[PDB]
Structures are given as structure tokens and as C-alpha cells.
Amino acid sequence: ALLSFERKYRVPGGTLVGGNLFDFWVGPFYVGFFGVATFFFAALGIILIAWSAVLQGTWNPQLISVYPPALEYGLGGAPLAKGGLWQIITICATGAFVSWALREVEICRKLGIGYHIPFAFAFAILAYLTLVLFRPVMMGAWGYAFPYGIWTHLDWVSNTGYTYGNFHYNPAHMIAISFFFTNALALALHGALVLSAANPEKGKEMRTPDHEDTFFRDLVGYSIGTLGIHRLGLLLSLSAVFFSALCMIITGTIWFDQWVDWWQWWVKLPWWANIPGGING
Amino acid sequence: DLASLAIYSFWIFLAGLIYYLQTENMREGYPLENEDGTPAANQGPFPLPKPKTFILPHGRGTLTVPGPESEDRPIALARTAVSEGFPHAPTGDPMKDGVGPASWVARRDLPELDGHGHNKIKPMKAAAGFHVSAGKNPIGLPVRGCDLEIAGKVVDIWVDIPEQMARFLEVELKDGSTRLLPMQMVKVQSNRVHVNALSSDLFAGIPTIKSPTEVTLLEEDKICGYVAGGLMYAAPKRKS
Amino acid sequence: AEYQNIFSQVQVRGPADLGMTEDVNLANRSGVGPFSTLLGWFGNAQLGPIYLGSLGVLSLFSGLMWFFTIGIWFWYQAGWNPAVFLRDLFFFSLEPPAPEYGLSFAAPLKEGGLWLIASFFMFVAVWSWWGRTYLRAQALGMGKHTAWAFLSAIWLWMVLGFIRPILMGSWSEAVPYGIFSHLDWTNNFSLVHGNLFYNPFHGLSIAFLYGSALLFAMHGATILAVSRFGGERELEQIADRGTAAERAALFWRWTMGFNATMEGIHRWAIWMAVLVTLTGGIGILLSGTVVDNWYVWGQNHG
Numbered sequence: 001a002l003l004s005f006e007r008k009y010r011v012p013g014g015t016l017v018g019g020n021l022f023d024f025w026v027g028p029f030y031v032g033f034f035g036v037a038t039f040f041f042a043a044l045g046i047i048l049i050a051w052s053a054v055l056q057g058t059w060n061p062q063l064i065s066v067y068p069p070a071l072e073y074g075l076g077g078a079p080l081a082k083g084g085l086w087q088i089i090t091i092c093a094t095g096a097f098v099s100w101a102l103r104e105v106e107i108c109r110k111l112g113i114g115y116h117i118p119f120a121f122a123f124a125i126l127a128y129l130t131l132v133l134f135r136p137v138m139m140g141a142w143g144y145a146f147p148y149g150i151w152t153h154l155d156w157v158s159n160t161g162y163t164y165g166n167f168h169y170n171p172a173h174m175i176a177i178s179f180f181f182t183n184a185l186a187l188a189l190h191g192a193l194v195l196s197a198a199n200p201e202k203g204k205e206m207r208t209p210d211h212e213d214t215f216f217r218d219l220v221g222y223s224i225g226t227l228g229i230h231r232l233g234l235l236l237s238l239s240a241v242f243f244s245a246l247c248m249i250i251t252g253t254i255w256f257d258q259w260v261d262w263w264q265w266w267v268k269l270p271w272w273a274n275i276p277g278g279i280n281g
Numbered sequence: 282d283l284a285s286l287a288i289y290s291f292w293i294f295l296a297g298l299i300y301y302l303q304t305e306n307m308r309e310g311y312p313l314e315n316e317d318g319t320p321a322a323n324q325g326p327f328p329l330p331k332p333k334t335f336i337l338p339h340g341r342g343t344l345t346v347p348g349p350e351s352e353d354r355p356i357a358l359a360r361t362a363v364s365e366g367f368p369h370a371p372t373g374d375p376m377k378d379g380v381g382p383a384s385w386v387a388r389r390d391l392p393e394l395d396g397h398g399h400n401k402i403k404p405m406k407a408a409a410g411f412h413v414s415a416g417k418n419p420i421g422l423p424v425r426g427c428d429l430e431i432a433g434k435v436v437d438i439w440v441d442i443p444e445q446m447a448r449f450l451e452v453e454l455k456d457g458s459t460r461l462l463p464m465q466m467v468k469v470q471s472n473r474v475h476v477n478a479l480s481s482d483l484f485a486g487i488p489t490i491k492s493p494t495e496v497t498l499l500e501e502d503k504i505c506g507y508v509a510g511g512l513m514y515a516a517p518k519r520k521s
Numbered sequence: 522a523e524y525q526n527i528f529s530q531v532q533v534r535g536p537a538d539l540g541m542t543e544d545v546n547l548a549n550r551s552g553v554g555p556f557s558t559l560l561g562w563f564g565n566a567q568l569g570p571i572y573l574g575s576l577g578v579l580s581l582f583s584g585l586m587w588f589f590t591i592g593i594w595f596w597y598q599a600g601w602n603p604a605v606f607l608r609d610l611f612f613f614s615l616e617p618p619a620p621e622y623g624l625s626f627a628a629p630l631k632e633g634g635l636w637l638i639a640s641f642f643m644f645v646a647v648w649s650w651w652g653r654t655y656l657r658a659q660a661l662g663m664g665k666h667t668a669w670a671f672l673s674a675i676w677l678w679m680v681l682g683f684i685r686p687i688l689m690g691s692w693s694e695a696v697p698y699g700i701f702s703h704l705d706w707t708n709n710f711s712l713v714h715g716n717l718f719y720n721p722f723h724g725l726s727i728a729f730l731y732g733s734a735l736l737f738a739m740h741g742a743t744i745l746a747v748s749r750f751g752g753e754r755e756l757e758q759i760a761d762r763g764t765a766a767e768r769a770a771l772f773w774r775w776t777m778g779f780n781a782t783m784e785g786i787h788r789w790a791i792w793m794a795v796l797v798t799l800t801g802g803i804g805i806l807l808s809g810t811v812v813d814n815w816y817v818w819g820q821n822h823g
């Protein structure tokens with residue numbers, strides 16, 4: 001049940017809501033008021049999802065799919081079988097997510113650490129809210145949201161993309177991808193660096209941070225340092241997801257045409273717009 | 282076909298890999314225990330990994346994990362219920378006792394050494410050629426606690442030499458003794474240094490270091506521990 | 522508000538650190554560079570020194586040759602006009618030889634030869650730099666994690682412009698050097714193989730990419746959350762568990778039911794990132810050599 005050093009940490013307090021009421025654990029897990037909140041939202045949501053599955057007449061997970069209301073319903077409510085169920089399920093997800101974040105906050109307090117983790121998570125939550133709330137509202141129907149199904153959701157991605165041409169040309173999409181790639185690069189390195197120091201060549205003594213900083217200056221002439229790379233990681237990650245939201249929130253709202261075409265602005269600057277030759281002249 | 286082969290293969294690879302990953306993270310704090318310290322009955326599907334031994338630089342010996350676990354300090358906590366899973370209430374002053382968000386681990390009572398075998402962290406006064414190169418130099422600024430009362434004055438900065446970084450502020454108290462304050466728990470302002478976790482009256486309780494030009498892993502933990510714990514336990518004294 | 526430790530609130534400097542001197546040939550290391558106070562607010566302010574050596578120079582020279590060989594081609598396309606060059610910079614493209622030449626090294630220069638030269642340059646550039654990551658580690662007595670991690674990346678690149686073009690029978694199947702052109706090639710590569718979303722490696726690869734972000738978010742925010750107990754000093758924490766490591770592990774145990782150790786978390790890390798291009802490489806390799814259309818394959822599973 002407890003890690004060899006856990007007991008002295010399991011003291012009362014830190015709860016945001018409800019005092020000592022839910023201030024307790026279940027196996028390794030911490031409950032807290034929000035422990036309960038998330039459970040309830042999670043229970044409800046899964047139920048509704050199964051209920052959608054009978055109306056659909058399949059129990060096969062590769063097939064199950066809960067779709068939003070069709071565009072004709074705009075931002076109004078829709079019949080269960082006709083889009084209501086997704087709308088509730090979406091409400092329930094949100095409930096789950098936010099609650100899961102606030103529990104993280106409550107654990108943070110009991111342990112006496114910073115709130116960076118709940119913090120970073122809120123970016124994930126905000127990306128999800130962008131795709132099922134902010135964008136549809138702004139566009140004008142729940143129908144612009146993505147459906148909850150394993151492959152159907154990949155389909156929405158593909159269809160929504162190809163609507164504006166090759167989505168690769170969405171400029172904030174370019175930026176968002178550069179982080180995803182960069183972050184992975186940096187996670188690759190960080191991990192590798194620490195391990196190689198902690199697990200040197202056979203029979204040698206554990207290396208030190210000094211070695212880590214040296215290994216990198218030797219390699220590329222600079223080392224961001226042990227505090228840096230952790231600040232770096234948090235940032236690349238949060239940024240990747242920040243730009244991911246951005247590229248979507250603008251798509252279909254302030255730009256509805258082909259993304260490639262938006263680049264004509266550059267190429268049509270009057271100072272070289274008419275100069276012959278090249279690719280565009 | 283080949284493709285089918287490859288993907289089935291991979292899902293198998295991936296499964297033994299997680300297994301590996303998982304057993305490696307079982308190198309500390311395992312095996313599990315009951316609230317009374319007796320070994321718990323259900324330790325999960327995963328076995329303890331076979332021990333590995335680390336050779337610590339500067340002849341500081343070896344470390345073998347997993348290995349015999351022991352807190353090596355008293356815990357002043359008492360059960361608040363008759364069944365498993367409820368908090369344990371401090372039986373004294375959690376701060377003074379070092380439980381809760383004020384907990385510290387019995388790390389070695391030796392300082393962290395740099396790659397050369399010299400003390401990693403030093404008061405800047407004794408760090409030949411170090412200076413505040415940017416930002417507000419705290420040194421000389423009064424220190425304010427969450428109760429908005431002055432508690433002391435910065436009389437130095439303890440720097441991390443190999444990473445060239447400010448780790449702690451040393452503070453001079455009203456009785457002429459000094460304490461270290463983690464850099465990460467204070468806001469350096471234009472005319473003062475503000476500490477939200479501790480009220481002026483608790484600065485004296487901050488554990489002291491035995492030698493004035495060195496800190497040990499044990500003393501770092503006891504200090505950081507203490508200051509962090511203020512956040513929850515000084516709470517009645519904090520106003521804003 | 523409380524301090525967050527995303528940016529330093531006081532910078533301290535000392536004599537330029539010339540670093541550990543294991544078995545490293547000190548005649549090769551450079552001189553210390555300046556110090557960016559800019560950088561200093563985020564991480565280390567000290568630039569340099571850097572280690573040159575034979576492999577560094579070869580790598581660094583081939584590296585520039587590659588880049589320049591592409592550059593002259595762009596200029597030739599731009600009508601040597603600096604204005605067009607700027608206008609049309611992302612439209613220019615150095616394309617592989619036509620399918621006609623196959624795996625031939627005899628394609629005319631304007632018709633694909635120049636692409637081979639550039640690639641040849643990149644090949645040597647990249648491999649030498651790989652050997653560089655390895656040696657730099659050896660000379661400090663360190664594990665070779667970094668070189669092996671690097672090898673994963675190399676895998677996907679090897680497969681894209683070398684191994685797959687060769688197994689298909691022609692260089693024309695490789696990726697063109699160009700900003701918009703390599704985007705198009707990617708988009709088109711999926712169309713031709715029946716939508717890469719049905720390539721289960723592609724799907725796996727995305728999971729590990731998404732995951733890398735998830736994890737580096739988790740790890741980073743955690744270490745920052747406990748840097749108030751010297752969390753970032755991970756090597757010593759491994760060697761002697763501090764409260765930092767404890768609070769870290771527990772926050773996670775209490776949230777989701779299990780947890781890492783300080784050495785452990787970094788194994789999760791290196792593998793989550795390395796699996797991105799590992800799986801990736803495989804998904805692409807089978808694409809068009811063994812499987813012509815992932816949807817059809819998806820219907821049968823063979």
C-alpha cells in the first residue's frame with residue numbers, strides 16, 4: 001500500500017473544497033472532493049457512450065462513434081440520437097478534465113510543491129476546448145466539432161484538413177509542428193544525457209553535471225544546463241500545443257480558403273511581384 | 282504477410298519494454314508497506330528488479346538499489362482513523378518535527394562536490410571571481426516575511442560554481458546569526474526580498490548549518506523542507 | 522505571487538568554465554566564447570568552448586557543401602536575381618532524378634545529378650556527426666546513449682532518402698530538397714499509399730510524438746515544481762534520494778497510481794522519443810515495398 005517513505009507525507013490538509021471530508025486515499029490514489037467529481041463525470045460519460053453504442057447497434061470499439069449534431073441544428077440543443085448525446089458527453093469530458101486538474105492542485109498543496117503540472121495540463125484541456133467549443137461557436141454549429149470514435153476522429157482530421165487544401169500550408173500549423181519535432185529532439189537528448197552520466201562506461205565512476213555541460217559544449221559549443229533543459233522542455237511542449245490551438249481557431253473563422261493561397265501575400269509584394277523569372281514569374 | 286508480422290512483433294517488443302521500464306522504477310521506496318511499516322501483502326505483478334550498484338565519484342563509495350530501506354529519523358505522526366487510507370496527524374509541531382510538506386530526507390551529511398572534488402555550492406564571498414552580472418543584487422536588501430514584517434538582511438549569495446547559478450540567499454537575523462533561504466522560494470524586489478512561505482517569527486526556526494562556508498545534502502533537505510512547509514503551516518500568520 | 526523559476530531573477534558569473542578534462546584531446550577544444558545574459562535569464566550564459574577535431578571539420582565542411590550545392594541551384598532557378606530569390610524562396614526545389622534513370626548515378630546535372638551530389642554531401646555530413654556524438658562521449662567515459670538515441674533519428678532519414686529509394690528501384694522516390702516541395706511530397710506520399718492514417722506504424726509514431734510532448738511536459742513541470750528542494754540536481758538525487766525525488770514520485774503516485782524514480786523517469790523519456798522515428802522508419806519502409814495501399818491492407822490485414 002505505501003512506498004517505503006510515504007507515511008510522513010500523508011498529513012491532513014491542502015484541500016480546496018470541503019475540508020477533511022474527502023481528505024483521504026484509496027490504495028495509492030488520492031481522492032479529495034475533486035477525486036469524487038471526476039469519478040462522477042467519468043461514470044456518467046462512459047454510460048452515455050455505451051447508450052450511444054446501442055442506438056448505433058454495435059459494441060465493437062473500432063466501430064463505435066458518437067457524432068455531434070448536424071450543422072442544421074446550429075448551436076442549439078439536438079435530440080439524443082441526433083446529437084444531444086455527444087453534447088452531454090462533451091460536457092462530461094470537460095467536467096472530468098477540469099476536475100482532474102483541480103485534484104492535481106489539491107495534491108500539490110498537500111505536498112508543498114509548485115503548481116507547474118496542473119498548469120501545463122491546462123494547455124491540453126484548452127486544445128480540446130478549442131476543437132469542441134471555441135471553434136464550433138465561432139463557426140456557428142456544434143457540427144464543426146470532431147466525433148468521439150477511434151477512427152472516425154482520424155477521419156474528421158483528414159476531411160477538415162483537406163477542406164483548406166494541403167493543411168501543411170497553414171502557417172501556425174508549420175510553427176506548431178516545429179515545436180513537436182523540436183521537443184521530441186530535446187526529450188531524446190535530455191534523457192540520453194542524464195542516463196549516460198548516471199550509467200558510464202563499465203567500471204567507471206558516475207559522472208557529474210560538469211560532465212554533462214562539457215559533453216555538450218564539446219558537441220555543439222553550448223549547454224543550456226540542468227535547470228535550463230527542464231525549463232526548455234516545459235516550454236517547447238506548452239508551445240507546441242499553444243500553436244496547435246491557434247492554427248485551428250483561425251481555420252474556418254478568419255481564413256476559409258485554401259491555405260496555400262494565403263502565401264500569395266508574400267509573393268505579391270509590389271517590389272518583386274512583377275519581376276519576371278523564378279517560379280512565380 | 283510481412284507488415285502483419287512486423288506490427289505483431291512490435292506490440293510484443295513494446296510489452297516487454299514497458300515491463301522493463303516499470304521494474305527499473307521500482308528501484309526506490311519498494312517494496313510497499315502498511316502504515317505500520319510491516320511489508321504489504323500485494324506488491325503488484327512486477328518483481329523487484331535485480332540490484333544495480335553505482336560507483337560514486339571522489340571515493341564516496343557505492344550505492345546499491347534496490348536495497349534495505351529505512352527512514353533513519355523519527356516520524357511524529359499519529360493515525361486519525363482505525364482503517365487504512367486516512368491522514369496521519371502531526372503529534373507536535375510539523376515544522377519543528379519535519380513531517381508533512383515540511384518533510385526532509387536523511388541524505389548524507391556531506392556536501393555535493395563538483396567534477397573536481399570541490400564543494401559545488403559556496404558563499405559568493407569565498408567564490409573567487411563571481412559577481413552578480415545581471416538583475417538586482419539582493420545583497421544588502423531587507424528580508425520581509427508573509428506577515429509583512431522585516432526578518433533580516435541578505436549578507437551574501439551562495440552560488441553554485443559549476444552551473445554558475447544563485448541557489449540560496451544567506452540572511453542575517455536580529456540576533457546576528459544567519460540562515461540560508463532557497464533562491465526558489467523568494468521574490469527579489471527593487472527595495473526588498475519578500476518570502477511568502479515564512480512569517481517573520483519563523484525564520485529563527487530555519488535549521489542552521491554546522492560550518493559557515495559549506496552546506497550538506499542533509500542540511501539542504503532540512504532547510505528546503507522547512508521553508509516549503511511554511512506554505513501550509515504558517516498559513517494563519519499570512520495576510521495579503 | 523510566488524516565484525515560478527521559469528526565468529532567473531539574479532545572474533551570477535565567474536571565470537569561464539573550460540570543463541572536465543577526461544581523455545579529451547585539449548588541443549582540439551576551442552577558446553571560451555562570450556556570455557549571453559540573454560540566454561542567462563533561461564539557462565547557461567557561457568558560450569563555448571567547442572571541440573573541433575577531424576570528424577567535426579569533415580562533418581561541418583560536408584554540411585556547408587550540401588547546403589551550398591542546394592543554394593546555387595536555387596540561385597540558378599531565380600535567374601540570379603536577388604529579388605526573385607527572395608520572392609520565390611520556398612518554391613524553389615532540388616528534385617531527384619527522373620524515374621527513367623532508376624538507381625543510376627548518370628543523370629544529367631540539371632536533371633537530377635546535382636541532387637545526388639547534395640545528398641552524398643549530406644550522407645557524409647550526418648554519419649560523421651554521428652561518429653562525433655559517440656567519440657565525444659567516449660572521451661569523457663560516458664554511456665553512449667546519445668549516439669544510440671541519435672541513431673533512431675538517422676533511421677527515418679536513412680529510410681526516406683536512401684533505403685526506400687533503393688528498394689523501389691529508383692532515386693525518384695526520394696525527398697526533394699525544398700521548403701514547400703518536401704511538404705508536397707509528404708502530402709502526396711500518403712495519397713499514393715492509400716492514406717497513411719491506416720499505416721499502423723504511422724499511428725504508433727503519432728502516439729509517441731504526442732506522448733513526447735505529454736512526457737516532457739510532465740517531467741519539466743515536475744522538476745520545476747520541486748526545484749525548491751534542488752530537484753534539477755538529478756545525478757546526486759539518483760545517488761542519494763532527496764525529498765525532491767520523493768515529493769516528485771508521490772505527487773504522481775497519488776494522481777495516477779504508479780510512479781517513476783529519478784533515473785527511471787529518464788528511461789521513460791529516452792524511449793518515448795526514440796520510438797517516434799523508430800516506428801516511423803518502419804511504417805515508411807513497408808510503404809510501397811510490401812504494402813501499396815494501407816486502406817486495402819487495413820480491410821484484410823495482409
Ligand code: BCL
Nearest residue numbers: 128146150151153154157723724725727728729731732735
Ligand atoms: C489533437 C490532434 C487531433 C487528433 C489526431 C490524431 C491522430 C492523427 C492520431 C491520433 C491517435 C490517437 N488519438 Mg487523437 N486526435 C485528437 C484528439 C484526441 C482526444 C481528445 C479527447 O481530444 C483523445 C483522447 C485522442 C486519443 C487518441 C488515441 C486513441 C490515439 C493515440 C493517442 C496518443 O498516443 O496520445 C499520447 C497519449 C498517451 C500515450 C497517454 C495515454 C493515452 C491513451 C492511449 C488514451 C486512450 C483513450 C481512448 C482509448 C479513449 C478513452 C475514452 C473513454 C474513457 C473510454 N485524440 C485531435 C482531434 N489522434 C493516433 C491513433 O493511432 O489512433 C487512431 C493517430 O494516428
Ligand code: BCL
Nearest residue numbers: 674678707708710711717718723726727730801802804805
Ligand atoms: C498529408 C500528410 C499525411 C502524412 C504523411 C507522412 C509522411 C510521408 C511521413 C509522416 C511522418 C510522420 N507523421 Mg504523418 N502524415 C499525415 C498526418 C499527420 C498528423 C496529423 C494529421 O495530425 C500527425 C500528428 C503526423 C505526425 C507524423 C510524425 C509522427 C511522423 C514523423 C516523426 C518525426 O518526428 O520525424 C521528424 C524527424 C526526422 C525526419 C529525422 C531526420 C533526422 C536527420 C538526421 C536530421 C538532419 C538535419 C539536416 C542534416 C540539416 C541540419 C540542420 C541545420 C544545421 C539547421 N502525421 C497525413 C496522413 N507523415 C513520417 C513517418 O515516420 O511516417 C510513418 C513520414 O515519413
Ligand SMILES: CC[C@H]1c2cc3[nH]c4c(c3C)C(=O)[C@H](C(=O)OC)c4c3nc(cc4[nH]c(cc(n2)[C@@H]1C)c(C(C)=O)c4C)[C@@H](C)[C@@H]3CCC(=O)OC/C=C(\C)CCC[C@@H](C)CCC[C@H](C)CCCC(C)C
Nearest residue numbers: 181184185188580581584646647650670671673674794795
Ligand atoms: C529521436 C527522434 C528525434 C531526434 C533525435 C536526435 N537528433 C539529434 C540527436 C538526437 C538524439 C543528436 O544527438 C544530434 C545532435 O547533435 O543534437 C544536438 C541530432 C541532431 N538533429 C538535428 C536536426 C533535426 N533532428 C530532427 C528530428 C529528430 N531528432 C527527432 C524528432 C529534425 C526534424 C526534421 O524534426 C531535425 C531538423 C541536428 C541539430 C543534429 C544533427 C546535426 C548534424 O548531423 O549535422 C550534420 C551537418 C552539419 C554540420 C550542417 C550544418 C549546416 C548549417 C550551417 C546550415 C544552415 C545555416 C542556417 C541558415 C543557420 C542559422 C540558424 C538560426 C536559428 C540562428
Ligand SMILES: CC[C@H]1c2cc3[nH]c4c(c3C)C(=O)[C@H](C(=O)OC)c4c3nc(cc4[nH]c(cc(n2)[C@@H]1C)c(C(C)=O)c4C)[C@@H](C)[C@@H]3CCC(=O)OC/C=C(\C)CCC[C@H](C)CCC[C@H](C)CCCC(C)C
Nearest residue numbers: 045093096100120121123124148149150241731734735738
Ligand atoms: C500540453 C502538452 C501535452 C500534454 C500535457 C499533459 N497531459 C496531461 C498532463 C500534462 C502536463 C497531466 O498532468 C495529466 C496526467 O495525469 O498525465 C499522466 C495529463 C493527461 N493527458 C492524458 C491524455 C492525453 N494527453 C494528450 C496530449 C497532451 N498532454 C499534450 C501534447 C493526448 C493526446 C491525444 O495528444 C492524450 C490522449 C491523460 C493520460 C492524462 C489526463 C487524464 C484525465 O483527465 O482523467 C480524467 C478523465 C477520465 C478518467 C476519463 C473521462 C471519460 C470521459 C468523460 C468520456 C470519454 C470522452 C472522450 C472525449 C472520448 C474521446 C475518444 C477518442 C477516440 C477521440
Ligand SMILES: COC(C)(C)C(=O)C/C=C(\C)CC/C=C(\C)CC/C=C(\C)CCCC/C(C)=C/CC[C@H](C)CC/C=C(\C)CCC=C(C)C
Nearest residue numbers: 589591592640641644678679681682683696698699700703
Ligand atoms: C544565401 O545564398 C547561398 C548560395 C550563399 C546559400 O547558401 C543559400 C542556401 C539555401 C537557399 C539553401 C536551402 C536549403 C533547404 C531549403 C534545404 C531543405 C532540405 C529539406 C527540407 C530536406 C528534407 C528531407 C531530406 C531527406 C530525407 C534527405 C535524405 C538524404 C539521404 C538519406 C542521403 C542519401 C544518399 C544519396 C542518395 C547518395 C549516396 C551515394 C553513395 C556513394 C553512398
Ligand SMILES: CCCCCCCCCCCC[N+](C)(C)[O-]
Nearest residue numbers: 075076077087088090091094133
Ligand atoms: C463546459 C460546457 C460544454 C458544453 C458543450 C456543448 C453544450 C451545448 C449547450 C447548449 C444547450 C442549449 N442552448 C442552445 C439553449 O443554449
Ligand SMILES: CCCCCCCCCCCC[N+](C)(C)[O-]
Nearest residue numbers: 299721722724725728732792793
Ligand atoms: C512508452 C509507453 C507508452 C506507449 C503508448 C501505447 C499506446 C498507444 C496506442 C496507439 C494506438 C494504435 N494503432 C496501432 C491502433 O494505431
Ligand SMILES: CCCCCCCCCCCC[N+](C)(C)[O-]
Nearest residue numbers: 026027028029323325777778779
Ligand atoms: C494505467 C493505470 C494503472 C494504475 C495502476 C494502479 C495500481 C493500483 C494497485 C491496486 C490498488 C487497489 N484497490 C483500488 C482495490 O485498492
Ligand SMILES: CCCCCCCCCCCC[N+](C)(C)[O-]
Nearest residue numbers: 299303324325326327778779780
Ligand atoms: C501508456 C502508459 C501506460 C503505463 C503503464 C502502466 C504501468 C502500471 C504499473 C502499476 C504499478 C503497481 N504498483 C506496484 C505501483 O502498485
Ligand SMILES: [Fe+3]
Nearest residue numbers: 194740744755
Ligand atoms: Fe530530468
